[PDB]
Amino acid sequence: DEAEASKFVEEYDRTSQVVWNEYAEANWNYNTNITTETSKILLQKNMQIANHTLKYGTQARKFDVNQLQNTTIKRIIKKVQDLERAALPAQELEEYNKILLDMETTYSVATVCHPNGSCLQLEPDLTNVMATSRKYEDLLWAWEGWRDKAGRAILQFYPKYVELINQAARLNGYVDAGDSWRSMYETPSLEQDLERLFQELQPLYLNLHAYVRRALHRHYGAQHINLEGPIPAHLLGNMWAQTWSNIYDLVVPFPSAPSMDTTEAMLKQGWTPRRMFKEADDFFTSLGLLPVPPEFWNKSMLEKPTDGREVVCHASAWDFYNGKDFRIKQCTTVNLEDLVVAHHEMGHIQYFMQYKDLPVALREGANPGFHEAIGDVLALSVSTPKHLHSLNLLSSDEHDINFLMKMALDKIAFIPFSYLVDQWRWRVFDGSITKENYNQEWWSLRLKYQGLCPPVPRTQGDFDPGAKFHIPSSVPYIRYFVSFIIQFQFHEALCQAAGHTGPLHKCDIYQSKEAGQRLATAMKLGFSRPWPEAMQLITGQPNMSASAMLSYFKPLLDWLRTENELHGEKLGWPQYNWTPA
Numbered sequence: 001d002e003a004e005a006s007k008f009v010e011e012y013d014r015t016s017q018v019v020w021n022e023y024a025e026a027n028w029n030y031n032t033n034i035t036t037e038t039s040k041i042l043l044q045k046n047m048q049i050a051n052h053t054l055k056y057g058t059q060a061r062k063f064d065v066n067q068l069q070n071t072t073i074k075r076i077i078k079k080v081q082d083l084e085r086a087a088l089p090a091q092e093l094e095e096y097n098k099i100l101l102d103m104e105t106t107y108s109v110a111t112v113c114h115p116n117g118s119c120l121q122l123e124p125d126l127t128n129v130m131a132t133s134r135k136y137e138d139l140l141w142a143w144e145g146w147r148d149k150a151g152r153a154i155l156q157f158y159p160k161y162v163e164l165i166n167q168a169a170r171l172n173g174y175v176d177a178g179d180s181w182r183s184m185y186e187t188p189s190l191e192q193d194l195e196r197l198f199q200e201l202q203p204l205y206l207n208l209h210a211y212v213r214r215a216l217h218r219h220y221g222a223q224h225i226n227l228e229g230p231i232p233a234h235l236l237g238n239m240w241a242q243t244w245s246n247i248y249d250l251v252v253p254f255p256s257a258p259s260m261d262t263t264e265a266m267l268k269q270g271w272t273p274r275r276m277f278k279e280a281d282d283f284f285t286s287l288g289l290l291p292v293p294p295e296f297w298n299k300s301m302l303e304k305p306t307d308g309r310e311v312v313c314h315a316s317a318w319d320f321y322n323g324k325d326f327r328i329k330q331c332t333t334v335n336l337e338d339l340v341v342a343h344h345e346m347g348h349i350q351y352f353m354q355y356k357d358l359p360v361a362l363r364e365g366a367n368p369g370f371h372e373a374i375g376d377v378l379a380l381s382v383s384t385p386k387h388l389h390s391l392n393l394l395s396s397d398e399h400d401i402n403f404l405m406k407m408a409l410d411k412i413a414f415i416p417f418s419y420l421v422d423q424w425r426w427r428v429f430d431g432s433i434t435k436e437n438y439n440q441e442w443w444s445l446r447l448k449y450q451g452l453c454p455p456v457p458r459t460q461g462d463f464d465p466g467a468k469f470h471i472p473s474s475v476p477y478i479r480y481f482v483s484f485i486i487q488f489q490f491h492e493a494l495c496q497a498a499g500h501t502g503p504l505h506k507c508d509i510y511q512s513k514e515a516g517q518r519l520a521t522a523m524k525l526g527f528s529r530p531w532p533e534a535m536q537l538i539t540g541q542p543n544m545s546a547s548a549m550l551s552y553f554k555p556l557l558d559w560l561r562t563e564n565e566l567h568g569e570k571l572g573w574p575q576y577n578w579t580p581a
């Protein structure tokens with residue numbers, strides 16, 4: 001019955017608005033104030049939202065989606081039929097919610113300390129060490145210590161987590177949790193599509209890897225780097241070696257063309273977290289996109305509290321599902337990296353605001369990759385030497401290659417990392433990888449895809465995946481692989497709309513109302529239409545394509561090949577068994 005479905009969807013929207021708003025507040029209150037009391041209230045709202053989800057989900061399952069005519073109502077009901085964790089029996093649901101809570105809390109409060117009594121937190125202490133230290137042993141201390149404290153402490157929870165998340169998936173008609181995660185893209189060919197995109201970026205990644213390995217050989221010494229082996233995983237300027245631009249100073253192609261310390265510039269010229277977010281807000285409005293409401297500035301947590309409060313620092317953007325209240329929670333440091341993060345997060349907020357009038361069920365991205373892409377698209381233009389000079393943070397093909405290198409260190413290096421995380425989890429979820437295999441299989445993928453090796457042997461009770469936020473927090477990762485591919489497609493299209501000609505990497509979309517309106521129309525759709533429609537609205541074609549990314553980096557690919565050939569570099573890691581002596 002079409003009229004009953006329409007009526008059901010209306011009731012679901014009305015009641016969802018209230019319940020999700022209440023859940024979000026409790027969730028926020030815990031994330032920004034980890035206490036016994038805030039934990040108790042959150043687990044109570046977990047029970048409330050589960051009750052709501054089970055009630056309406058059960059009702060939604062009585063409708064045959066295929067026998068419905070209206071596609072908007074069709075999409076909503078299909079979504080509501082998946083109860084997710086609320087499909088679990090009472091006892092399993094309570095256990096699962098507690099496991100999630102304990103895993104996230106464990107990760108967010110973990111510290112690494114020295115013999116004396118000095119303790120370092122991930123943000124900003126360990127992050128800074130990985131970024132700035134050029135001493136092998138100091139990097140090793142932080143890399144290993146973080147894994148000892150955070151990773152090992154997640155291991156006790158993970159097998160039960162996997163059991164319960166799989167159980168829930170099966171109760172909602174999937175074979176395992178990985179199957180359910182993949183299905184959210186509504187794309188039968190997803191795995192092959194992603195494999196092909198990965199393969200296309202291989203020449204670029206292998207050449208970048210070889211060039212960086214040579215540079216590391218130069219700084220860290222011949223005795224510590226195998227020129228035909230994988231790179232030690234603690235040397236790339238980042239805790240997870242997922243993005244490499246923090247070691248730009250070690251790899252700069254033309255050091256005769258120097259850039260200034262952007263951290264020093266931001267600090268000295270009076271940049272603050274609030275000013276960093278205002279700047280992102282100002283970039284969005286320059287495109288004719290929406291400003292964040294006054295409420296955002298009053299309610300957001302834009303820096304780590306000095307209250308004594310314990311918090312979840314990992315950046316995130318919060319929709320409170322009332323079309324008015326949107327917030328960012330971020331332990332912002334004054335530097336260029338976190339300015340990029342601020343833009344990324346403000347992209348989520350823009351998306352929230354664009355689709356705020358849609359029913360709650362459709363208040364998400366065309367796919368999760370789209371939601372991650374938005375902020376990054378703008379950040380690509382933010383990062384251009386042109387835009388950074390206009391901000392006074394900085395003051396010829398040599399400069400072009402230098403810039404493309406800095407960009408590649410993040411955008412290219414991240415491709416194999418973002419690919420492997422869920423390759424690992426899909427195989428854990430489907431039973432291919434079990435607890436006695438967790439860490440070994442992780443490192444097999446780290447080697448296979450990124451060409452990295454652990455700097456110290458991994459031992460009994462190590463759980464290195466646990467030391468990466470998205471693992472204990474159960475945040476799917478393939479969204480980020482998709483984002484990095486599609487953000488270049490969006491950049492290309494917006495630049496074309498802005499009238500840009502010549503090398504794609506020289507494009508800066510600042511001030512382009514045409515670029516802004518292209519994104520706005522797609523964002524307003526939310527989850528109302530299959531994602532290829534939104535892809536076509538932005539780009540003029542319906543596919544994910546690595547073409548735009550390859551086009552952006554083409555001059556660097558040419559430069560890297562010539563440079564690597566001159567040094568007779570072996571692309572890849574033949575000596576794949578090599579580890580530090």
Ligand SMILES: O=C(N[C@@H](Cc1ccccc1)P(=O)(O)C[C@H](Cc1cc(-c2ccccc2)no1)C(=O)N[C@@H](Cc1ccc(O)cc1)C(=O)O)OCc1ccccc1
Pocket residue numbers: 020023024027049180181182184316317318319364368473474475476
């Ligand atoms: O992305 C999903 N789940 C999404 C489906 C999906 C599964 C696998 C692969 C791809 C897609 P869906 O149910 O819209 C995801 C939706 C809405 C939502 C809120 C957030 C979020 C992000 C950062 C901070 C705070 C919230 N992200 O998404 C969802 O989780 N709905 C909850 C309600 C909720 C509302 C607000 C909130 O803060 C938290 C939860 C529910 O149905 O119970 O799971 C990831 C995840 C992990 C931890 C915390 C939040 C989200």
Ligand SMILES: O=C(N[C@@H](Cc1ccccc1)P(=O)(O)C[C@H](Cc1cc(-c2ccccc2)no1)C(=O)N[C@@H](Cc1ccc(O)cc1)C(=O)O)OCc1ccccc1
Pocket residue numbers: 243314315316317318337340341344345348364365368371372376410414473475480
């Ligand atoms: O807030 C989130 N998600 C956050 C994670 C989260 C999910 C659920 C619950 C709690 C938290 P994040 O990915 O913004 C929070 C951040 C983003 C980030 C990092 C960086 C970055 C760039 C260079 C150097 C250092 C950092 N830039 O952007 C994140 O988790 N990013 C991934 C992947 C990533 C990496 C680099 C990058 O440029 C972009 C993304 C990571 O840190 O591993 O989701 C909101 C949302 C709500 C509804 C529907 C869709 C989306």
Ligand SMILES: *[C@@H]1O[C@H](CO[C@@H]2O[C@@H](C)[C@@H](O)[C@@H](O)[C@@H]2O)[C@@H](O[C@@H]2O[C@H](CO)[C@@H](O[C@@H]3O[C@H](CO)[C@@H](O)[C@H](O)[C@@H]3O)[C@H](O)[C@H]2NC(C)=O)[C@H](O)[C@H]1NC(C)=O
Pocket residue numbers: 006007009010070071072073358359
């Ligand atoms: C399929 O159904 C959708 C959604 O319908 C809406 O939700 C149902 C559960 C019921 O409550 C309906 O009464 C309700 O309309 C239809 O989409 C909707 O179409 C209307 C009319 O085109 C849109 O209204 C517009 O609103 C804007 C701003 O207020 C005005 O500028 C326009 O003049 C216009 O009135 C409405 O926004 C839209 N809603 C959504 C969520 O998409 C859809 O038309 C229908 N499809 C078919 C083929 O009938």
Ligand SMILES: *[C@@H]1O[C@H](CO)[C@@H](O)[C@H](O)[C@H]1NC(C)=O
Pocket residue numbers: 033035036037038307309
């Ligand atoms: C944190 O939560 C506690 C309850 O445990 C509450 O008393 C306090 O007001 C909260 N702190 C802040 C700064 O909101």
Ligand SMILES: [Cl-]
Pocket residue numbers: 240464465
């Ligand atoms: Cl690791």
Ligand SMILES: [Cl-]
Pocket residue numbers: 368369476477478479
């Ligand atoms: Cl995803």
Ligand SMILES: [Zn+2]
Pocket residue numbers: 344345348371372
């Ligand atoms: Zn994000």
